[PDB]
Amino acid sequence: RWKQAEDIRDIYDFRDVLGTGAFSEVILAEDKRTQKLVAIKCIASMENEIAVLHKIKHPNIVALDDIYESGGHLYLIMQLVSGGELFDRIVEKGFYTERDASRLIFQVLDAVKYLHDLGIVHRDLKPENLLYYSLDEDSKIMISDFGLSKMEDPGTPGYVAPEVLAQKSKAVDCWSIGVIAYILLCGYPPFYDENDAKLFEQILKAEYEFDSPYWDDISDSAKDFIRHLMEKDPEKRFTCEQALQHPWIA
Ligand SMILES: Nc1ncnc2c1ncn2[C@@H]1O[C@H](COP(=O)(O)OP(=O)(O)OP(=O)(O)O)[C@@H](O)[C@H]1O
């Protein structure tokens, strides 16, 4: 049961478009009453997404402040982040140092652990879904887009876990985080091929390598960290707790 609005333009003052999605559009707006700036996700599974966001409150996760129904369109009023996505900053940098990447992955693990503890699994972690709070180089990262998250009971290739592809659980996110760590360290994905079917085979078989010379001087500890997240067997795969403990992070 969400609020109805005759027109959202009465409540919010729309400015620039911040971004677009397959089925959404994100606009910078001003709350007319409080004069604060917000990011409004406009949409023309979504109920799953909302239910999830209502359980969540973490400094490194984009908050849902409220929702309005107006003219067949949902308007998710959301915490504004202005730093753009991690994907872009990997491009405008090439790769991260071990120290910087480790700080970033910490903030990610901290947040996903908080979710796993709430029985929430994101299922779509990737650089494009990680948003910086600010333009400043020191800005914290924020987890966003819960459009595919699943709550416990009583996806982009490259980042999805082998078992997800063999068919259609918390281990899923831990794989993704390993792949994000791999990319931050070396600047390119662990799975890469021109043929989609071959690519799809690589991920299923979970065959990747810290290839020389790119990986030559990356620490054994970083590599051990990645192997333990990027582990084929979901049973043996590191949890967020085990990954937080690992010396590369701690
Ligand atoms: N809270 C926010 N603050 C600032 N910008 C945002 C915010 N949320 C999303 N954006 C921008 O808009 C884009 C919207 O994408 P989103 O996170 O919704 O995932 P998507 O797959 O692109 O869209 P969707 O999943 O809703 O179809 C983001 O990549 C980002 O650039």
Numbering used by the authors: 9 to 52, 62 to 171, 180 to 193, 196 to 277
Reproduce text from the manuscript describing this model:
When activated, CaM binds to and stimulates the activities of a family of Ca2+/CaM-dependent serine/threonine protein kinases (CaMKs), thereby regulating their functions. However, the regulation mechanism of CaMKI remains elusive. Here we report four crystal structures of three truncation variants of human CaMKIα, namely CaMKI320 (residues 1–320), CaMKI315 (residues 1–315), and CaMKI293 (residues 1–293), which correspond to the aforementioned three truncation forms of CaMKI, respectively. The catalytic core of CaMKI takes a canonical bilobate architecture, with the N-terminal lobe (N lobe) consisting of five antiparallel β-strands and a prominent helix named helix αC and the C-terminal lobe (C lobe) comprised primarily of α-helices.
CaMKI293 lacks the autoinhibitory segment and exhibits a constitutive activity comparable to that of the full-length enzyme. Consistently, the CaMKI293-ATP structure resembles the Akt/PKB-GSK3β structure and displays the structural features of an active conformation. Specifically, helix αC assumes a position similar to that in the active Akt/PKB-GSK3β complex, and concomitantly Glu66 of helix αC adopts the same conformation as that of Glu200 of Akt/PKB and forms a salt bridge with Lys49. The bound ATP maintains similar interactions with the enzyme as in the CaMKI320-ATP and CaMKI315-ATP complexes but the phosphate groups of ATP also have a high average B factor, indicating a high flexibility that probably allows conformational changes to occur readily when the metal ion and/or the substrate bind to the catalytic site. In contrast, in the CaMKI293-ATP, the C-terminus (residues 278–293) is disordered, and consequently helix αD and the αD-αE loop show evident conformational changes. Concurrently, the space originally occupied by the C-terminal part of helix αR1 is vacant for substrate binding. The conformations of helix αD and the αD-αE loop particularly Tyr113 in CaMKI293-ATP are similar to those of the equivalents in Akt/PKB-GSK3β. In CaMKI293-ATP, with the rearrangement of helix αR1 and the consequent relaxation of helix αD, the constraint on Glu102 by Lys300 of helix αR2 is removed. The side chain of Glu102 displays a positional displacement of 1.5 Å towards the catalytic site and binds to the 3′-hydroxyl rather than both hydroxyls of the ribose of ATP. Lys49 of strand β3 moves upwards along with ATP by 2.5 Å and forms a salt bridge with Glu66 of helix αC.
